[PDB]
């Protein structure tokens, strides 16, 4: 299950003149999530899908850093030079990513009017301008202020909802347990179980030297429910004598995997 954030600041600018007013547009995991004001975040569907659970989080800590972007970007704006008459925009939706793999991406871009004219990588931080060309100065213009001032948060925050609940995260690993039957001459019955996990799509089986066993020589139990709505099964094959040095239970959920030895 990947996530990402993105905030979208507009800012306005009439002949030249960058008006007091702005507007960001919020998305949590691709849905409307807030809309805020200079001075108010309203929640929106996913708004108050967390809004019960924590109360009013989605006000404060972000109303309070949103408007601050805003007003920075508000002077961003009124730095630009070539502000023909009309009224203007600057938006700058900062993205982040949280992938599969764990790994993180964070971006952010800029356009004036709506045409995208430069845009950054946050986390390698390298500039680049879209295909066309002469929005050059105005991707200047901007860089060099935004260096001039200088003379994570998102992320931080993704993780945040994430952790306090306000996106519920679903996939629940399994719990793996090697356990040995006790035998005789056919020898021992060792058995793979899986447990608690969702979704349903779960992948068990045994490896002898590290090949993995044929459909036969084991034995399989089947996808069934188990605590709090998961699902549960269980995979074993008839080891011989002191071989289990040998065998290990391999199992794969979601994108995730681990091996596990037999007990001894
Ligand atoms: C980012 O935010 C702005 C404001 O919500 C979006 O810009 C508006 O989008 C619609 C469709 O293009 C236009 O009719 C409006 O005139 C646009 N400008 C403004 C100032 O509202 C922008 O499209 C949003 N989304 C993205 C991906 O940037």
Same mark, same amino acid.
């Given at each position: 299950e990947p996530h990402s954030l993105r905030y979208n600041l507009t800012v306005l600018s009439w002949d030249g003149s960058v008006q007091s007013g702005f507007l960001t547009e919020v998305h949590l995991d691709g849905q409307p999530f807030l809309r805020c004001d200079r001075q108010k975040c309203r929640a929106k569907p996913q708004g108050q899908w967390a809004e019960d659970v924590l109360?009013? +989080? &989605? %006000?404060d800590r972000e109303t309070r850093d949103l408007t601050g972007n805003g007003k920075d970007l508000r002077m961003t704006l009124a730095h630009?030079?070539? $502000? +023909?008459?009309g009224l203007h925009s600057l938006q700058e939706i900062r993205v982040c990513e949280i992938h599969e793999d764990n790994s993180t991406r964070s971006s952010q871009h800029f356009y004036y009017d709506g045409e995208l004219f430069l845009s950054q990588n =946050?986390? &390698?931080k390298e500039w680049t301008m879209p295909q066309?060309? @002469?929005?050059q100065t105005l991707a200047m213009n901007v860089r060099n202020f935004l260096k001039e001032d200088a003379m994570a948060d998102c992320l931080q925050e993704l993780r945040r909802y994430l952790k306090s609940g #306000? #996106? =519920? @995260? @679903?996939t629940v690993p399994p719990m793996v347990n090697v356990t040995r039957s006790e035998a005789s001459e056919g020898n021992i019955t060792v058995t793979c179980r899986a447990s608690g996990?969702?979704? %349903?799509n779960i992948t068990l089986s045994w490896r002898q030297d590290g090949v993995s066993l044929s459909h036969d020589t084991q034995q399989w139990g089947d996808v069934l429910p188990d605590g709090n709505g998961t699902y549960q099964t269980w995979v074993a094959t008839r080891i011989c004598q002191?071989?289990? $040095?040998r065998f290990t239970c391999y199992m794969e959920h979601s994108g995730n995997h681990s091996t596990h030895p037999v007990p001894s």
């Amino acid at each position: 299950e990947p996530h990402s954030l993105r905030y979208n600041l507009t800012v306005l600018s009439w002949d030249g003149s960058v008006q007091s007013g702005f507007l960001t547009e919020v998305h949590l995991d691709g849905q409307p999530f807030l809309r805020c004001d200079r001075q108010k975040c309203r929640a929106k569907p996913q708004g108050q899908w967390a809004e019960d659970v924590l109360g009013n +989080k &989605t %006000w404060d800590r972000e109303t309070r850093d949103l408007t601050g972007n805003g007003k920075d970007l508000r002077m961003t704006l009124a730095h630009i030079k070539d $502000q +023909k008459e009309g009224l203007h925009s600057l938006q700058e939706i900062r993205v982040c990513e949280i992938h599969e793999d764990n790994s993180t991406r964070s971006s952010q871009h800029f356009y004036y009017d709506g045409e995208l004219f430069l845009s950054q990588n =946050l986390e &390698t931080k390298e500039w680049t301008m879209p295909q066309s060309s @002469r929005a050059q100065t105005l991707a200047m213009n901007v860089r060099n202020f935004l260096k001039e001032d200088a003379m994570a948060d998102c992320l931080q925050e993704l993780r945040r909802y994430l952790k306090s609940g #306000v #996106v =519920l @995260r @679903r996939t629940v690993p399994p719990m793996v347990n090697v356990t040995r039957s006790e035998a005789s001459e056919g020898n021992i019955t060792v058995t793979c179980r899986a447990s608690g996990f969702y979704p %349903w799509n779960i992948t068990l089986s045994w490896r002898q030297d590290g090949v993995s066993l044929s459909h036969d020589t084991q034995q399989w139990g089947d996808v069934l429910p188990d605590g709090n709505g998961t699902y549960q099964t269980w995979v074993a094959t008839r080891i011989c004598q002191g071989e289990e $040095q040998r065998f290990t239970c391999y199992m794969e959920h979601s994108g995730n995997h681990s091996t596990h030895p037999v007990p001894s």
